Design a protein around this ligand. Structure first.
Ligand SMILES: Cc1cc2nc3c(=O)[nH]c(=O)nc-3n(C[C@H](O)[C@H](O)[C@H](O)COP(=O)(O)OP(=O)(O)OC[C@H]3O[C@@H](n4cnc5c(N)ncnc54)[C@H](O)[C@@H]3O)c2cc1C
Ligand SMILES: Cc1cc2nc3c(=O)[nH]c(=O)nc-3n(C[C@H](O)[C@H](O)[C@H](O)COP(=O)(O)OP(=O)(O)OC[C@H]3O[C@@H](n4cnc5c(N)ncnc54)[C@H](O)[C@@H]3O)c2cc1C
Ligand SMILES: NC(=O)C1=CN([C@@H]2O[C@H](COP(=O)(O)OP(=O)(O)OC[C@H]3O[C@@H](n4cnc5c(N)ncnc54)[C@H](O)[C@@H]3O)[C@@H](O)[C@H]2O)C=CC1
Ligand SMILES: NC(=O)C1=CN([C@@H]2O[C@H](COP(=O)(O)OP(=O)(O)OC[C@H]3O[C@@H](n4cnc5c(N)ncnc54)[C@H](O)[C@@H]3O)[C@@H](O)[C@H]2O)C=CC1
Lengths: 281, 268
């Protein structure tokens, strides 16, 4: 009936969007020789998809090196992450110029976490220190430390007004949440795209942990979807890929033409999802 | 409230033999309503089909339905085979005619089986019409004949255009065919092989699907994920349309069908 014809149109419209969807991949500095091997293999694999750009997380660092290793190994725009943790404004400016003179003109401005300065201040700083393409974080399901939804929302506009080139959302599994949030944004005056951050889930346990610490919700249907798969890595991957592909299908239909993938240094899942989006070698 | 069944085929090599039993153990934990095994005239013969059925029965205690064709087989041979199965606990048979290399049609086999014993009988249905049918009307009338002859249920040829199945089911009901029209689901991980199958059976492959597998000839892992996504989508749609039974053409592989069943609520 309707559900049948709807899926056909939805799959067809996605098939036609092949070629005009931008994707970016997020990685993290490896802590072992094994993970280093995995990372550089995922980078080589995902590079064939010619992403808009790739980013590297910032702890508290090999971040700078990896960025460098990428820009010259593949020649892709590498955007390093930067926080306000354990660093003074003077040091920050140092690092800033230390990147600009290295070909790095794209940075993901973030506050960071501790076990007194906000992201907004870092945005203005990078803008005060130079003119980088600032990418900040957005939270469709409100950041934990936010006073209220509107308060958190107003902060994003504050970061955008500060000079943020674009916003990248925290991962989510409730598509409605993202959509209504994106509406709330434009309805608030923010004129930048709220690029959805996609987390392809193969390890539900880890994913559930991340969610609890980021105030992200795990809809019941999803919890049921992975229930009983603790010892079935292969099935978890198929189920996880299915969920991600469906999510990115709905978003694509809703006009979203940009996606940021939390690869966790793995390429296959993100690679497959991109494939369904028309992003191929 | 969803029931499932899995179809396997007689292995022709030691490696496939290994693969098959690994899949049987894996899938058996899902407690399928029944499992079936195909028949290949020039690819295994009925002894190989019989062998697998006996193996499944003795090893899992699951209902195993052998596929039986009436081509190049005399009525007396068929009765002998039928009686042999029945006395050995095999009470479900997928009655098929088999491809012509007229004699007797599937409906004739159904009638012949019911005479031997009160067998549980499943017959083939084609949402996109059997390729040799004089017409869609005649092909449907034939399904009616097979059901009227004693067929307990119909199992459709695989399809990728879900609406073709939905429209077909409606025609069956309008035709008075009251048995269940169980959709045959083909999870695709090897598109080239699936396209060959589809082309030989006039099963339509939607443009979006052909595009989905384009460029993955040497990427088995991506084909699996894409295929699983397509399959899970289909069963979800079908499930919402009242389908309570699914038959999986596992091709002797378990992962894809296992995952799909999981997303359907069918778990160990
Ligand atoms: C794409 C992405 C990448 C990330 N990468 C990393 C990484 O590499 N390294 C890392 O350490 N962390 C990373 N994080 C996590 C992030 O640093 C944490 O979520 C952290 O809690 C700070 O958030 P923020 O950067 O959005 O800062 P902010 O935008 O400052 O938001 C944090 C909180 O401060 C509140 N707020 C802002 N201004 C004010 C004000 N003036 N008064 C009162 N309240 C205010 C906000 O409402 C919010 O609750 C990432 C997150 C995303 C979504
Ligand atoms: C679930 C399923 C399982 C299968 N398993 C196997 C298997 O294990 N082994 C194997 O060899 N094949 C198998 N097949 C394939 C099948 O045997 C072929 O499609 C075969 O050509 C027809 O078999 P049937 O049982 O549908 O025969 P029938 O139902 O007799 O149909 C065949 C054709 O004859 C027509 N017809 C019926 N009566 C008449 C009449 N009196 N005059 C003229 N035309 C008539 C029908 O409209 C149709 O075109 C399977 C198919 C399905 C869908
Ligand atoms: N989206 C988020 O909320 C992110 C938060 N972070 C925080 O910054 C820290 C330093 O970065 P790394 O060196 O990469 O840490 P890490 O090496 O301990 O973690 C590696 C990667 O796992 C993922 N991850 C870890 N904790 C996460 C969380 N709570 N939520 C979502 N994803 C998470 C991220 O991709 C991270 O890059 C992380 O430990 C984490 O606390 C980092 C990336 C994303
Ligand atoms: N569901 C269907 O349409 C089936 C059709 N058949 C036909 O009967 C012939 C003889 O049987 P086998 O010796 O097993 O052949 P085979 O040995 O060439 O094929 C082995 C198995 O692969 C699967 N298969 C092959 N072709 C298929 C098709 N077109 N559609 C769906 N599944 C297919 C079946 O499980 C079959 O048992 C097959 O070659 C095929 O043409 C057999 C089983 C199922």
């Amino acid at each position: 009936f309707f559900h049948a014809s709807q899926r056909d149109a939805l799959n067809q419209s996605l098939a036609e969007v092949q070629g005009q969807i931008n994707v970016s991949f997020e990685f993290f500095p490896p802590r072992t020789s094994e993970m280093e091997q995995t990372l550089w293999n995922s980078i080589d694999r995902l590079s064939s998809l010619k992403p808009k750009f790739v980013s590297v997380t910032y702890g508290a660092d090999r971040t700078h090196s990896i960025i460098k290793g990428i820009k010259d190994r593949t020649g892709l725009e590498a955007a390093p992450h930067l926080t306000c943790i354990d660093a003074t404004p003077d040091e920050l400016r140092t690092i800033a110029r230390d990147y600009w003179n290295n070909g790095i003109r794209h940075i993901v401005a973030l506050r960071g976490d501790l076990p007194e300065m906000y992201a907004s201040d870092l945005v203005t700083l990078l803008k005060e220190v130079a003119d980088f393409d600032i990418s900040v974080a957005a939270y469709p399901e409100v950041h934990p430390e936010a006073k209220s939804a509107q308060a958190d929302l107003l902060n994003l506009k504050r970061k955008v007004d500060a000079g943020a080139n674009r916003a990248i959302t925290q991962f989510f599994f409730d598509v409605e949440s993202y959509l209504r949030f994106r509406d709330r944004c434009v309805s608030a005056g923010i004129d930048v795209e709220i690029i959805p951050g996609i987390l392809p889930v193969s390890n539900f346990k880890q994913a559930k942990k991340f969610a609890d610490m980021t105030n992200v919700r795990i809809p019941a249907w999803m919890a049921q979807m992975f229930d009983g798969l603790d010892d079935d890595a292969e099935t978890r991957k198929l189920v996880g890929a299915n969920i991600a592909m469906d999510m990115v299908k709905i978003l694509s239909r809703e006009g979203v033409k940009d996606f940021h993938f939390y690869t966790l240094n793995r390429a296959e899942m993100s690679y497959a999802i991109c494939h369904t989006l028309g992003v191929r070698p």
